[PDB]
């Protein structure tokens, strides 16, 4: 169930200083970046154009290029109209895309780090709890029929279509298996598991065949080579270390679990 997420981060510092930077993710793999410094959307994979033609890619980029400009002008005009009520600095975040199963699309907008607005059905709406000054700019935005028709097209049609092209074209990278390497250290005993892909994994402290229940699994931390890192810790009496092992199961291993004895 691959979630395709397009993430825009726009910071407005004052009058005439701002920037917008975007990244695009298909599941946990980055497929695009779009720097404020760049006129064009960058590929971060050989397959980042999916099944789109050079021409179709070009149009979709030009629309995003007009959008990035329109967005910036619009937000700056809105602050101007609001003054002094809404003041710089302003942080806007957009998270837009689709999740495949059939599919469902989303476009969520946060302001000052808080979710305020979504596109849903045929219109923009503020979300419950959002500041009331947003109601009138959303109403105005809603009167732009062309934009609503474009956004509906992108969310309902384009996204799922582009992503089925990515899944096909990215298949080799998406379905890649990388093997984890484990090591132990430490009282609290730490089992470090690095370099695995995909994300699902099982790491447990054992005494023979018995899973040690106090095993605290940590957060998944990414490595820079599109693999994962995880630790699992166990608090043990400084009389118990003997006989304990760390066991790792992972799809890449083929039933040959890593077992590391303390």
């Amino acid at each position: 169930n691959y979630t395709f997420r397009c993430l825009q981060m726009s910071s407005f510092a004052n009058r005439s200083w701002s920037r917008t930077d975007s990244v695009v993710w298909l599941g946990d793999l980055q497929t695009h970046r779009w720097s404020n410094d760049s006129a064009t959307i960058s590929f971060t994979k050989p397959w980042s154009q999916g099944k789109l033609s050079n021409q179709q890619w070009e149009k979709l980029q030009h629309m995003f290029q007009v959008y990035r400009v329109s967005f910036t002008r619009d937000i700056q005009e809105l602050v101007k109209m609001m003054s002094p009520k809404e003041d710089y600095p302003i942080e806007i975040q957009l998270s837009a895309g689709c999740e495949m199963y059939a599919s469902e699309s989303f476009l969520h907008v946060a302001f000052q780090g808080k979710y305020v607005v979504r596109f849903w059905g045929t219109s923009w709406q503020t979300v419950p709890g959002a500041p009331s000054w947003l109601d009138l700019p959303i109403k105005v935005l809603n009167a732009d029929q062309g934009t609503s028709a474009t956004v509906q097209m992108l969310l309902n049609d384009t996204c799922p279509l582009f992503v089925r092209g990515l899944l096909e074209a990215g298949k080799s990278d998406l379905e890649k298996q990388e093997k984890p390497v484990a090591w132990l250290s430490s009282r609290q005993l730490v089992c470090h598991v690095s370099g695995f892909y995909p994300k699902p994994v099982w790491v447990m402290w054992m005494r023979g065949d018995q899973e040690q229940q106090g095993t605290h699994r940590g957060d998944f931390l990414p490595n820079a080579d599109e693999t994962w890192y995880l630790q699992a810790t166990l608090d043990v009496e400084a009389g118990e270390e003997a006989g304990l092992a760390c066991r790792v199961k992972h799809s890449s291993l083929g039933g040959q679990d890593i077992i590391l004895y303390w």
Binding site: M9, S11, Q93, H192, S194, D219, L221, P222, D225
Partner: protein
């Protein structure tokens, strides 16, 4: 404003004298402007590679810094972070196991 969390860990099992990669993963901060340095014996490592800034489901930012490093019996490594949420730079040292 949200305060950055910092985790420092290595790509491969650290073994003294063998080249490795040190990661500094900084998460849970807002706003997105931030300065991240990686330190060898408290001195700034110049070659530091950053991922693109991105953000999570709860909207808080994250970013990954990494650098080549060779652990030894005599070198400390750290990640130092400057962010509007904190009055002073926040430094976390590689605990030498991670």
């Amino acid at each position: 404003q949200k305060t950055p969390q910092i985790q420092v860990y290595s790509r491969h099992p650290p073994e003294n004298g063998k080249p490795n990669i040190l990661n500094c993963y900084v998460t849970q901060f807002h706003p997105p402007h931030i300065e991240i340095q990686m330190l060898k014996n408290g001195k700034k490592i110049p070659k530091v590679e950053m991922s693109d800034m991105s953000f999570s489901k709860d909207w808080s930012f994250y970013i990954l810094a990494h650098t080549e490093f060779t652990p030894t019996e005599t070198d400390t490594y750290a990640c130092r972070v400057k962010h509007a949420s904190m009055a002073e730079p926040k430094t976390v040292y590689w605990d030498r196991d991670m």
